[PDB]
Amino acid sequence: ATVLLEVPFSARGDRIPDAVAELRTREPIRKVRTITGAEAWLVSSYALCTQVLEDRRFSMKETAAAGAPRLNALTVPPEVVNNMGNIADAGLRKAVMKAITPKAPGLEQFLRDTANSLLDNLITEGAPADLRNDFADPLATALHCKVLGIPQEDGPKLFRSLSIAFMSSADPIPAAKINWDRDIEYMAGILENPNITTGLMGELSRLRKDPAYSHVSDELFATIGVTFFGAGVISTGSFLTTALISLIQRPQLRNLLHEKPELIPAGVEELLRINLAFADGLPRLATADIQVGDVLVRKGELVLVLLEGANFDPEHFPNPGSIELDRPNPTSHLAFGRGQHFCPGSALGRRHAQIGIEALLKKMPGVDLAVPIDQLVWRTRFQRRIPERLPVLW
Amino acid sequence: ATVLLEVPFSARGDRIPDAVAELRTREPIRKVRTITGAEAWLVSSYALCTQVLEDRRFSMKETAAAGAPRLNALTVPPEVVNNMGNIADAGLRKAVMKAITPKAPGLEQFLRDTANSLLDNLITEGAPADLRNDFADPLATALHCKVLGIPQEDGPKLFRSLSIAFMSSADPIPAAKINWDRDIEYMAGILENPNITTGLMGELSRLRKDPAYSHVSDELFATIGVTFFGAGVISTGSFLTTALISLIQRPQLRNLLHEKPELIPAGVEELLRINLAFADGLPRLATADIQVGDVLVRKGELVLVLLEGANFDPEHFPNPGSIELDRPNPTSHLAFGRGQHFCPGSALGRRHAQIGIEALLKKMPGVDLAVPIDQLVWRTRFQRRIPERLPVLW
Numbered sequence A, B: 001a002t003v004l005l006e007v008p009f010s011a012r013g014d015r016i017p018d019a020v021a022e023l024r025t026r027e028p029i030r031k032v033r034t035i036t037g038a039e040a041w042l043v044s045s046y047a048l049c050t051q052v053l054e055d056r057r058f059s060m061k062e063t064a065a066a067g068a069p070r071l072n073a074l075t076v077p078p079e080v081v082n083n084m085g086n087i088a089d090a091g092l093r094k095a096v097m098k099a100i101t102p103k104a105p106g107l108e109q110f111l112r113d114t115a116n117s118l119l120d121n122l123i124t125e126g127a128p129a130d131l132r133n134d135f136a137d138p139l140a141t142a143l144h145c146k147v148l149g150i151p152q153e154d155g156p157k158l159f160r161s162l163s164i165a166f167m168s169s170a171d172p173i174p175a176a177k178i179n180w181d182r183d184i185e186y187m188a189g190i191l192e193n194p195n196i197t198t199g200l201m202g203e204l205s206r207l208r209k210d211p212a213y214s215h216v217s218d219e220l221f222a223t224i225g226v227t228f229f230g231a232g233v234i235s236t237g238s239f240l241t242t243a244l245i246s247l248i249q250r251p252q253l254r255n256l257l258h259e260k261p262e263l264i265p266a267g268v269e270e271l272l273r274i275n276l277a278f279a280d281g282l283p284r285l286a287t288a289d290i291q292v293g294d295v296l297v298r299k300g301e302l303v304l305v306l307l308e309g310a311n312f313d314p315e316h317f318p319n320p321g322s323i324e325l326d327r328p329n330p331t332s333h334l335a336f337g338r339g340q341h342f343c344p345g346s347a348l349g350r351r352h353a354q355i356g357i358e359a360l361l362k363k364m365p366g367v368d369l370a371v372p373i374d375q376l377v378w379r380t381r382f383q384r385r386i387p388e389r390l391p392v393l394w
């Protein structure tokens, strides 16, 4: 008597469990138990992961349904799970997506200036430095304040919500609601603030008073701010942190990218491909009986799309664990998802990582871990895998 | 084929593994493998734990011997493992121990004022609060600056060394030496600083220039500062943090202690007894062949004294998992060790916890976790078990 295989497998973000490949080979769709006690189907091949993400009958929205089998507890109101649908329904999708590209004048220069300041401060203070708490996350937080059009000084408090907001918990989290409600009131005030005229919130603030959006709720406008700040900051800060580990562990690659920084975009795409920051499969609920591989998934069942399942699939990415800058299919990974809910911040995510890495390699060409890799403390029961601190020297 | 039982068993500090009692019953001394790959004897009964700690032929000093089986890598120079011997040999033991009692005029008032300020700040900011990073540790750090006689503003930088200095690592940790060397230079400067006239460092500074200590090394004086600050802050901050979890989880006890705070000392003694903050057994190396229970420990072998083994031993503490304020043997636990290396800060440790708890209960009588207990992130490969954050509401 063993128990049903539990997910997630490991909170360690520096290496993929040997188990994933064994599972992909033996049973690329298989039954697992989540932290709530619910059963789910874990999908781990590139082929099946793509099938599920490209079939909307595997629904994101319906994961929020009362009584559904759950990966984890909601940390937002249930309607907010369909945030992107809600945005599209309100006629705001084009405007939202336009505000969060890396293309606004001054944005990239702001990113570089900010990275360089953070780095200069670390160099002035002397090794060891914490690249997560004192570089990657602050860079993410600064970026998103700028992208939203909100004061830099407001970023830290919003950031402080995230260690709870992105928990992956069996049970509802009282602190999540306290912080959610507070952050919503914050964004509501931002929309009322005549001095906020730039970024996403500046644009939302104008659309809010345009007749074509008079019946769009103030709740939805505030929700867009909280949701995009949170997803953006947690996703970019965590990706960059774990990408830095991948790089640091590859001195040859570090030197190549330092010597030839025009390769940094190709480097970042591979670092995205091999990234283990998403802690759990992407959840979807079946709205029909659907054949996936050898399993007939039944209506009402939960499906988890394991991104590293797809991204380390040797059928699609030969020598999957190696960073190779000359692959013929380099953006075909699932780091940003696929299909209806493909990441709307993908360009911005790329640029944050590319600029952060460029700046780091320039300032700290000798960057290395200052502790044995095993000494990193991996955050548990969270929607990302991240080291609590990332101590480096240079 | 299983492997040899590995230690430590769990980094979770909120509950003792069912395994410990099974082990204590079946094999209260048994072979284990440490994180270095070394074999060791894990001792887990009150009787055998006391036997080992009271027999100096199980040596602390000799754990630092080149080529010995190791629990973990040294994070200090090897001579520093015998710090207390070194202090006693230099004629400084009485003076050191006198400076770190809770008895200096103003000290306890300082502790209370500090706790109350920290708490007021949390209340002003609003729930949720992090009781580790924003109460217990800062209280510990403030206390030890005061005890040492050094500026409060110097505490945070010294504190920042500790997440690495008290790692429990398989391998040497480069950052540990960087920080050690820096902190030693700091304490050396303190001894040269004419404005430092109080506390432990004020007293050491005077003894340093007294003829009776002219041939005591400046290295040893600086080492006393780094070592006592580190052990003190990590031990009190971590104990208080985990004691707060124990209390919060016991609303009846929380209310009793709030209503009748004269019971807080008895409460703190039980919280000490059941505390799981020490992450690993206390290491000793056998300097002779010695019978321990059914095992003849051989010269050169490593022995690990599992404090919760002793402290949850139902033979000595009936109903060991229950906090009972009327036990007939309440201080007979091993939270502060036993024998030659009994904690020299035990009184101070008690008072820090008693004052912190009194202040918390007064200010936050409604204190409760703001997240499900399972959502706490337990620090790994560290010499203490502690949650990275302790989110509360009240």
Ligand code: HEM
Residues within 6 Å of the ligand: A060, A084, A085, A100, A227, A228, A229, A231, A232, A233, A235, A236, A239, A282, A283, A334, A335, A336, A337, A338, A340, A341, A342, A343, A344, A345, A346, A348, A349, A350
């Ligand atoms: C390297 C950085 C990033 C990575 C790796 C990443 C990854 C992802 C992934 C895998 C999804 C799909 C989730 C699903 O299908 O269940 C997603 C969606 C999303 N992302 Fe990103 N993301 C990043 C950056 C950003 C940024 C910068 C923002 C906003 C400023 C953002 C906002 C969002 C939002 C709002 C969704 C939900 C899309 C939907 O539900 O339709 N992300 N992201």
Ligand code: HEM
Residues within 6 Å of the ligand: B060, B084, B085, B100, B227, B228, B229, B231, B232, B233, B235, B236, B239, B282, B283, B334, B335, B336, B337, B338, B340, B341, B342, B343, B344, B345, B346, B348, B349, B350
């Ligand atoms: C609740 C607070 C504390 C707890 C639970 C605690 C626990 C312990 C334990 C179990 C030992 C024995 C280690 C061994 O035998 O291997 C010890 C030793 C020691 N403690 Fe504490 N301690 C606390 C507070 C303090 C404070 C406040 C200081 C100093 C200001 C301190 C300084 C030391 C030192 C220097 C040793 C080494 C003793 C030796 O090697 O002879 N501790 N502590």
